């Protein structure tokens, strides 16, 4: 996102606002035809593509509402302050710094990092249903779970990964007990 | 639900991986604190597009 | 199948570590363990 500093409020905010978003789900929910697609955000100067070299030069914000307006649960993680004036960008959403593999872990922000790394490797040999057309491919060594189940603790990302239509496991009623030694 | 992204060679799904390299056309400086008489080496790996 | 397509690679300082600059570019989490820890990394 592109912070904007000279703004009607007399301080910084985002060039993106509600109407923009409104037409989005509007265009999303065609599915008349105006197609307020991602591209439009660009040529409207809404969000700016940014690379590594460029980052050296800027000062980004974690979450907009978190930070941009100048200004509680004990169970909440403790969050940093908005002292920083000259923000020029705000992150789209930080949970978008994870690979395909990571954003299938529930709550990857509560575990111990190598666990994730272990998890990252593991799904890639979790069996599941790799591709719906499967009945007609003549591949070798394809493995298909029977009654795949969409998980419970999903993750706002994973929808995009269409996991919830080709899931790779089952919810199971597990009990953490020292039952019989075995 | 397929997404392409790849080829078929002799009928088997191959995939080009991103390899990675240093970027060309970059001035770069290192040390060489090996006792060799060269205590700083600036480089550039010129490439023609 | 997906992540595989967004893999990278790095044949062969310390190029196995996880530099600041990888923020949001390559996955801070996923990398196969062993010989290629670090040198394989997914977008």
């Amino acid at each position: 996102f592109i912070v904007e500093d000279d703004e009607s409020l007399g301080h910084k905010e985002l060039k993106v606002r509600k109407g923009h978003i409104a037409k989005l789900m509007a265009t999303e929910y065609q599915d008349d035809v105006e197609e307020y697609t991602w591209s439009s955000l660009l040529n409207e100067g809404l969000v700016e593509y940014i690379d590594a070299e460029e980052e050296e030069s800027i000062l980004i914000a974690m979450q907009p509402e978190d930070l941009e307006p100048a200004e509680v649960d004990p169970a909440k993680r403790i969050r940093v302050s908005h002292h920083a004036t000259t923000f020029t960008h705000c992150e789209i959403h930080p949970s978008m710094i994870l690979g395909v593999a990571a954003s299938i872990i529930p709550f990857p922000d509560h575990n111990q990092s190598p666990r994730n790394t272990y998890q990252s490797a593991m799904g890639k040999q979790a069996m599941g249903v790799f591709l719906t057309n499967y009945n007609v491919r003549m591949d070798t060594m394809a493995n298909i779970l029977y009654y795949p189940q969409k998980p419970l603790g999903t993750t706002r990302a994973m929808e995009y990964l269409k996991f919830r239509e080709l899931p790779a496991g089952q919810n199971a009623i597990v009990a953490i007990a020292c039952y019989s030694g075995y | 639900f397929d997404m392409g992204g790849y080829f078929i060679i002799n009928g088997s799904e191959k995939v080009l991986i991103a390899q990675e390299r240093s970027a060309g056309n970059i001035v770069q400086v290192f040390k060489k604190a090996a006792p060799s008489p060269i205590s700083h080496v600036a480089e550039i790996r010129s490439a023609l597009e | 199948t997906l992540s595989h397509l967004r893999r990278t690679n790095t044949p062969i300082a310390k190029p196995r570590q996880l530099h600041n600059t990888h923020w949001g570019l390559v996955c801070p989490a996923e990398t196969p363990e062993g010989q290629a820890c670090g040198l394989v990394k997914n977008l």
Binding site: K18, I21, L41, E159 | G5 | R6
Partner: peptide, 30 residues
């Protein structure tokens, strides 16, 4: 409102477009 400043949960809208725009193989197909 139409010019109102945004809330986090919006962004998922922004994102879901981005993928609708591109997909996941983008740089490959590009």
């Amino acid at each position: 409102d139409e010019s109102a400043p945004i809330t986090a949960e919006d962004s998922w809208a922004v994102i879901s477009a981005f993928f609708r725009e591109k997909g996941l193989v983008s740089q490959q197909l590009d």
